[PDB]
Amino acid sequence: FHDLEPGPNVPEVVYALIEIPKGSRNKYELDKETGLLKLDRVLYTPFHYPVDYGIIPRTWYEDGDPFDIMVIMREPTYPLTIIEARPIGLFKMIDSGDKDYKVLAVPVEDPYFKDWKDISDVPKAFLDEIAHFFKRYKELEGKEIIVEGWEGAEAAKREILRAIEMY
Amino acid sequence: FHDLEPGPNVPEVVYALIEIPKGSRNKYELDKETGLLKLDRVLYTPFHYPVDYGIIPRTWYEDGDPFDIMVIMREPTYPLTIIEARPIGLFKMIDSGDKDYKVLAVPVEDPYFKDWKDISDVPKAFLDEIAHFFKRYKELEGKEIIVEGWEGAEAAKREILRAIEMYK
Amino acid sequence: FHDLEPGPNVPEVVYALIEIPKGSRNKYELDKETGLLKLDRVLYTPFHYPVDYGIIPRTWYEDGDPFDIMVIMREPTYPLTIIEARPIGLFKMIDSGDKDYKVLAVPVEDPYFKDWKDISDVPKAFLDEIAHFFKRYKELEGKEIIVEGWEGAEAAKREILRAIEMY
Amino acid sequence: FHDLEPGPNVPEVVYALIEIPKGSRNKYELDKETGLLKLDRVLYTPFHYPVDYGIIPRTWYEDGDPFDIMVIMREPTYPLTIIEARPIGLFKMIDSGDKDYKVLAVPVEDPYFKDWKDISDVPKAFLDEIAHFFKRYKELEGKEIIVEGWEGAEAAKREILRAIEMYK
Amino acid sequence: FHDLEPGPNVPEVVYALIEIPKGSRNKYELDKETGLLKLDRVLYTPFHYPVDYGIIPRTWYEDGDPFDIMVIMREPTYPLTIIEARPIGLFKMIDSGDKDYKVLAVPVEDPYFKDWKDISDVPKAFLDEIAHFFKRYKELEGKEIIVEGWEGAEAAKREILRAIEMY
Amino acid sequence: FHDLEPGPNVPEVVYALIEIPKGSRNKYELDKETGLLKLDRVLYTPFHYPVDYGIIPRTWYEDGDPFDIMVIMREPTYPLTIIEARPIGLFKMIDSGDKDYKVLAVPVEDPYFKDWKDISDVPKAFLDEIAHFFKRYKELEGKEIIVEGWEGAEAAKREILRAIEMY
């Protein structure tokens, strides 16, 4: 089952339940019916998840699916691992005509990112790398998405607080 | 960790709960009570599993252990992840008196194997490396294992059913 | 571990419930309110654990924390992997405030260590490589640790049945 | 490091000197003068090569660089190792004005691919992931690349010859 | 390296000829009488190099040895990999007998460090993680090292053209 | 080309030019016509080289092929890497009716094996693991071999000195 919480200070520090460790071509997903890790699909192209992709406990990103969070990690964690994350941005894209934003966060417990606190704290090539990833990783799956851009911490925190109360 | 079902439409597609990620030399089993991961043993020889090995939920085979399944995976998965596998063959092997059969399943969610529906679609070398592995991976342990051969998907599934029925 | 017999033989055949697989730089920890894997920190230096690091269920060690056990593995397992271990020694050190004793062990089901029963059977340098490890990993984090030395197997097996009963 | 020949019997089997081991995100090229490994660049997107990429010794193609070869390898090899590859197809792609074609070769010394003689033997998904990779792996860099398609082994080899003849 | 232009721009665009890929615990070295890769030693502690470690061809540094350069790479290369680097700093330390200065650099052809030119652009903790590294790796081998601190990019670029000419 | 030497003290310490790093399923081989690494074959079975397999510079194991040496290494080296090796045993087997012995050595520069100097210094499960490997790794290649056993250092040193003078 799951019943864990959104995290400590909330908009400030949040919990990140990881499903896909950086470097994976295999896209996993936490099962709601079981609570165990299940294989969603193997990316049709040689893309490797650029970050530790996961969700934030008990959040409701409109309808259904929890709010997804991308944690920058210098060494991938294992699926189903909880991370205390400091949001720093909001990746904004539209899939089937709808907003499909995601929280770009960073690890609290890794001094490397101690002074990282807002998109303008992340080299641009990286952001473009995460962006270029969602833009093409499902293309062979007959899906194309429209990318809008990013937003800083506040928007992130802003969306999180919401997604949570919406939950 | 067995409150889950044998999978989607049982015959044609089942769930494979992995225990051993491809390329591993540590042999992990799914603990009875706990459900958690258990270091079964460290193979006595420099072999690494050539597939993702695991079990089909809610199934019981001849010996008296879950029906084992082998999912051919390009990139290994983590012990305990669920996988929607499509059987394509049955591995017949006898471990020390026990009729220890295994299913050869492929990922439903990887196009690479889009046209791997039956044992006749698998490169004969791969099948060969698979039987050789079991044929010998225990030799040092003292257990001698005889290999019998292969059977296609239909067989695989016929056995899947029977295993499900034996859980009860 | 919420519930799990400490080990099937005691003294000897003990149950090691790994948290940090050898080779890892991410220091993981097990939470009791959840039972899920949780990222605790990221070693501030480029240090990688020299052994799988775990704990013995249903134990209690003087500081309140469980009983830490270092299993010596060739190929690292996965966090939450239950390993039937077998303590061949005890590593004495103090995180500066209450002694923090780790239990050096060897996995059964691996003929490789067939003849490993005391720290005397353990190559010296290795033993050292560990000593240095704790005597130096947190240092960077502005913290010190007093590493005395090692104690025998029976020694370890002593502090062990203590804690396994101390409940 | 090019005193070596195009390979055994040139058409049917060539040598492939690898530069990029499968699964790598760092792009390595074979330095002109030195011969030694050169970090060409770090791909701008989370792509990892899906094959062992390298060059056919003593060959020169249209653009003005060695004829490139792709060896499908289960377990990647080290940059600079030689491999006896068996072509089975030709990848047609145009990089910024240049007719940048590549050979699709398989290992002679891996039974797994025993029956991979032509492009029709390759799982269509794999071929698809291959073209998608080139089609986009440079997008961020500013270079836009158009993909043209595939041709079988005969084609591959016809081009191998021509490349050899252009070295001279 | 028997022969190879130190780098195409000097000051800046320098030629780094890696010996020990980041992540490695085997300390490799390049032999001049052969030019082949050679195992030099195995760090006595479970330390793994934090960066690809190399040297600048056709240089000479006060002790007779070449000029060491630490490139900061995301994915490690392979020994004998020529990387067009770019020194953003200088790491000052002394192996106890003659100062041993390393040259912290950043690879070009990796937009990620697009804006890395001085140690000020380098996350602090990281810089530290290195400092600790040398200030602690050989210790176990009954040896000490005096780690002062870091110096700027121009600082590094200075000691550099020294050695590149000192021949 | 190659022209390197057998090693330092000779029967005592020897050089090991590695072709196949521990963990490889891919069997490589140093090319005599080129001197570059070439792929011999990919093992027909999921065996992974148990050790760093290689050759000793300028040795003549009867006809042709250089004397092969197996170095025990806790972390694999890269192909074409030179290692100073301390012989400790002779693996004895017969392939096509002939002796096809190999030198089992150990790394000088890794304190872990400081006190390893003779087969009786290597856990037995390991020796049986190396042995079981050659016994079956070419079976699917229609070849079966006959395994005789091992011999200690002196035999090794004895065979090396010979193989060299024979060269």
PDB file of N, CA and C in Angstrom, chain F residues 124-162:
ATOM      1  N   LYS F 124      39.523 -22.451  -1.849  1.00  0.00           N
ATOM      2  CA  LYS F 124      39.355 -23.510  -2.810  1.00  0.00           C
ATOM      3  C   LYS F 124      38.218 -23.316  -3.769  1.00  0.00           C
ATOM      4  N   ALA F 125      37.137 -22.684  -3.322  1.00  0.00           N
ATOM      5  CA  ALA F 125      35.970 -22.466  -4.193  1.00  0.00           C
ATOM      6  C   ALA F 125      36.332 -21.654  -5.413  1.00  0.00           C
ATOM      7  N   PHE F 126      37.288 -20.753  -5.244  1.00  0.00           N
ATOM      8  CA  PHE F 126      37.737 -19.920  -6.332  1.00  0.00           C
ATOM      9  C   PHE F 126      38.483 -20.767  -7.362  1.00  0.00           C
ATOM     10  N   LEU F 127      39.462 -21.522  -6.895  1.00  0.00           N
ATOM     11  CA  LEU F 127      40.197 -22.342  -7.814  1.00  0.00           C
ATOM     12  C   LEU F 127      39.214 -23.224  -8.565  1.00  0.00           C
ATOM     13  N   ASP F 128      38.235 -23.782  -7.858  1.00  0.00           N
ATOM     14  CA  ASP F 128      37.286 -24.666  -8.522  1.00  0.00           C
ATOM     15  C   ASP F 128      36.461 -23.889  -9.514  1.00  0.00           C
ATOM     16  N   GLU F 129      36.277 -22.600  -9.253  1.00  0.00           N
ATOM     17  CA  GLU F 129      35.508 -21.703 -10.118  1.00  0.00           C
ATOM     18  C   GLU F 129      36.296 -21.428 -11.416  1.00  0.00           C
ATOM     19  N   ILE F 130      37.578 -21.116 -11.287  1.00  0.00           N
ATOM     20  CA  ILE F 130      38.405 -20.910 -12.478  1.00  0.00           C
ATOM     21  C   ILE F 130      38.469 -22.234 -13.298  1.00  0.00           C
ATOM     22  N   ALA F 131      38.660 -23.340 -12.590  1.00  0.00           N
ATOM     23  CA  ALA F 131      38.716 -24.644 -13.206  1.00  0.00           C
ATOM     24  C   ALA F 131      37.407 -24.981 -13.897  1.00  0.00           C
ATOM     25  N   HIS F 132      36.284 -24.904 -13.182  1.00  0.00           N
ATOM     26  CA  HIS F 132      35.002 -25.226 -13.795  1.00  0.00           C
ATOM     27  C   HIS F 132      34.717 -24.390 -15.033  1.00  0.00           C
ATOM     28  N   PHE F 133      35.302 -23.201 -15.067  1.00  0.00           N
ATOM     29  CA  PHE F 133      35.169 -22.281 -16.201  1.00  0.00           C
ATOM     30  C   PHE F 133      35.818 -22.837 -17.510  1.00  0.00           C
ATOM     31  N   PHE F 134      37.101 -23.147 -17.460  1.00  0.00           N
ATOM     32  CA  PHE F 134      37.720 -23.667 -18.676  1.00  0.00           C
ATOM     33  C   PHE F 134      37.140 -25.017 -19.090  1.00  0.00           C
ATOM     34  N   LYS F 135      36.706 -25.786 -18.108  1.00  0.00           N
ATOM     35  CA  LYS F 135      36.130 -27.089 -18.350  1.00  0.00           C
ATOM     36  C   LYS F 135      34.833 -27.006 -19.153  1.00  0.00           C
ATOM     37  N   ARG F 136      34.051 -25.953 -18.968  1.00  0.00           N
ATOM     38  CA  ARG F 136      32.821 -25.892 -19.724  1.00  0.00           C
ATOM     39  C   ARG F 136      32.626 -24.734 -20.642  1.00  0.00           C
ATOM     40  N   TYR F 137      33.430 -23.683 -20.525  1.00  0.00           N
ATOM     41  CA  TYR F 137      33.181 -22.497 -21.363  1.00  0.00           C
ATOM     42  C   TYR F 137      33.244 -22.688 -22.877  1.00  0.00           C
ATOM     43  N   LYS F 138      33.871 -23.746 -23.379  1.00  0.00           N
ATOM     44  CA  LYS F 138      33.914 -24.007 -24.836  1.00  0.00           C
ATOM     45  C   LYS F 138      33.083 -25.278 -25.249  1.00  0.00           C
ATOM     46  N   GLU F 139      32.420 -25.881 -24.272  1.00  0.00           N
ATOM     47  CA  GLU F 139      31.598 -27.048 -24.518  1.00  0.00           C
ATOM     48  C   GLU F 139      30.611 -26.886 -25.699  1.00  0.00           C
ATOM     49  N   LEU F 140      29.889 -25.770 -25.745  1.00  0.00           N
ATOM     50  CA  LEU F 140      28.970 -25.553 -26.840  1.00  0.00           C
ATOM     51  C   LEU F 140      29.752 -25.325 -28.129  1.00  0.00           C
ATOM     52  N   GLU F 141      31.060 -25.151 -28.004  1.00  0.00           N
ATOM     53  CA  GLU F 141      31.882 -24.969 -29.186  1.00  0.00           C
ATOM     54  C   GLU F 141      32.396 -26.346 -29.580  1.00  0.00           C
ATOM     55  N   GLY F 142      31.680 -27.385 -29.155  1.00  0.00           N
ATOM     56  CA  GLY F 142      32.079 -28.747 -29.492  1.00  0.00           C
ATOM     57  C   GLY F 142      33.422 -29.230 -28.963  1.00  0.00           C
ATOM     58  N   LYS F 143      33.974 -28.508 -27.989  1.00  0.00           N
ATOM     59  CA  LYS F 143      35.251 -28.884 -27.403  1.00  0.00           C
ATOM     60  C   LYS F 143      35.111 -29.193 -25.944  1.00  0.00           C
ATOM     61  N   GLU F 144      35.768 -30.261 -25.537  1.00  0.00           N
ATOM     62  CA  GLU F 144      35.729 -30.672 -24.153  1.00  0.00           C
ATOM     63  C   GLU F 144      37.194 -30.751 -23.790  1.00  0.00           C
ATOM     64  N   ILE F 145      37.513 -30.414 -22.559  1.00  0.00           N
ATOM     65  CA  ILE F 145      38.914 -30.453 -22.159  1.00  0.00           C
ATOM     66  C   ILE F 145      39.052 -31.390 -20.986  1.00  0.00           C
ATOM     67  N   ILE F 146      40.270 -31.786 -20.658  1.00  0.00           N
ATOM     68  CA  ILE F 146      40.470 -32.645 -19.500  1.00  0.00           C
ATOM     69  C   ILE F 146      41.257 -31.835 -18.444  1.00  0.00           C
ATOM     70  N   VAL F 147      40.706 -31.689 -17.248  1.00  0.00           N
ATOM     71  CA  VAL F 147      41.385 -30.897 -16.225  1.00  0.00           C
ATOM     72  C   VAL F 147      42.222 -31.750 -15.291  1.00  0.00           C
ATOM     73  N   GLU F 148      43.482 -31.387 -15.095  1.00  0.00           N
ATOM     74  CA  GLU F 148      44.360 -32.182 -14.229  1.00  0.00           C
ATOM     75  C   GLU F 148      44.417 -31.661 -12.816  1.00  0.00           C
ATOM     76  N   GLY F 149      44.628 -30.362 -12.648  1.00  0.00           N
ATOM     77  CA  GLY F 149      44.677 -29.821 -11.309  1.00  0.00           C
ATOM     78  C   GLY F 149      45.491 -28.550 -11.289  1.00  0.00           C
ATOM     79  N   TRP F 150      46.076 -28.237 -10.136  1.00  0.00           N
ATOM     80  CA  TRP F 150      46.900 -27.058 -10.000  1.00  0.00           C
ATOM     81  C   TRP F 150      48.302 -27.411  -9.507  1.00  0.00           C
ATOM     82  N   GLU F 151      49.197 -26.438  -9.464  1.00  0.00           N
ATOM     83  CA  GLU F 151      50.539 -26.654  -8.952  1.00  0.00           C
ATOM     84  C   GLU F 151      50.874 -25.309  -8.342  1.00  0.00           C
ATOM     85  N   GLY F 152      51.724 -25.313  -7.321  1.00  0.00           N
ATOM     86  CA  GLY F 152      52.053 -24.082  -6.616  1.00  0.00           C
ATOM     87  C   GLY F 152      52.931 -23.097  -7.334  1.00  0.00           C
ATOM     88  N   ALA F 153      53.469 -22.140  -6.591  1.00  0.00           N
ATOM     89  CA  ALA F 153      54.325 -21.110  -7.197  1.00  0.00           C
ATOM     90  C   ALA F 153      55.531 -21.671  -7.975  1.00  0.00           C
ATOM     91  N   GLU F 154      56.422 -22.374  -7.284  1.00  0.00           N
ATOM     92  CA  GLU F 154      57.601 -22.921  -7.932  1.00  0.00           C
ATOM     93  C   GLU F 154      57.317 -23.490  -9.322  1.00  0.00           C
ATOM     94  N   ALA F 155      56.336 -24.368  -9.453  1.00  0.00           N
ATOM     95  CA  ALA F 155      56.043 -24.875 -10.793  1.00  0.00           C
ATOM     96  C   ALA F 155      55.787 -23.673 -11.724  1.00  0.00           C
ATOM     97  N   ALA F 156      54.915 -22.770 -11.295  1.00  0.00           N
ATOM     98  CA  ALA F 156      54.655 -21.604 -12.106  1.00  0.00           C
ATOM     99  C   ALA F 156      55.994 -20.983 -12.500  1.00  0.00           C
ATOM    100  N   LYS F 157      56.747 -20.516 -11.502  1.00  0.00           N
ATOM    101  CA  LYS F 157      58.033 -19.862 -11.748  1.00  0.00           C
ATOM    102  C   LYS F 157      58.902 -20.723 -12.667  1.00  0.00           C
ATOM    103  N   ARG F 158      58.856 -22.026 -12.394  1.00  0.00           N
ATOM    104  CA  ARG F 158      59.591 -23.028 -13.159  1.00  0.00           C
ATOM    105  C   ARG F 158      59.189 -22.988 -14.640  1.00  0.00           C
ATOM    106  N   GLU F 159      57.900 -23.059 -14.909  1.00  0.00           N
ATOM    107  CA  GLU F 159      57.417 -22.988 -16.281  1.00  0.00           C
ATOM    108  C   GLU F 159      57.713 -21.617 -16.939  1.00  0.00           C
ATOM    109  N   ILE F 160      57.498 -20.527 -16.203  1.00  0.00           N
ATOM    110  CA  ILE F 160      57.770 -19.181 -16.720  1.00  0.00           C
ATOM    111  C   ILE F 160      59.237 -19.087 -17.204  1.00  0.00           C
ATOM    112  N   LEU F 161      60.179 -19.272 -16.284  1.00  0.00           N
ATOM    113  CA  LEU F 161      61.592 -19.203 -16.643  1.00  0.00           C
ATOM    114  C   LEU F 161      61.874 -19.952 -17.927  1.00  0.00           C
ATOM    115  N   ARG F 162      61.272 -21.128 -18.040  1.00  0.00           N
ATOM    116  CA  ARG F 162      61.431 -21.963 -19.223  1.00  0.00           C
ATOM    117  C   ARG F 162      60.869 -21.228 -20.449  1.00  0.00           C
TER     118      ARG F 162
END
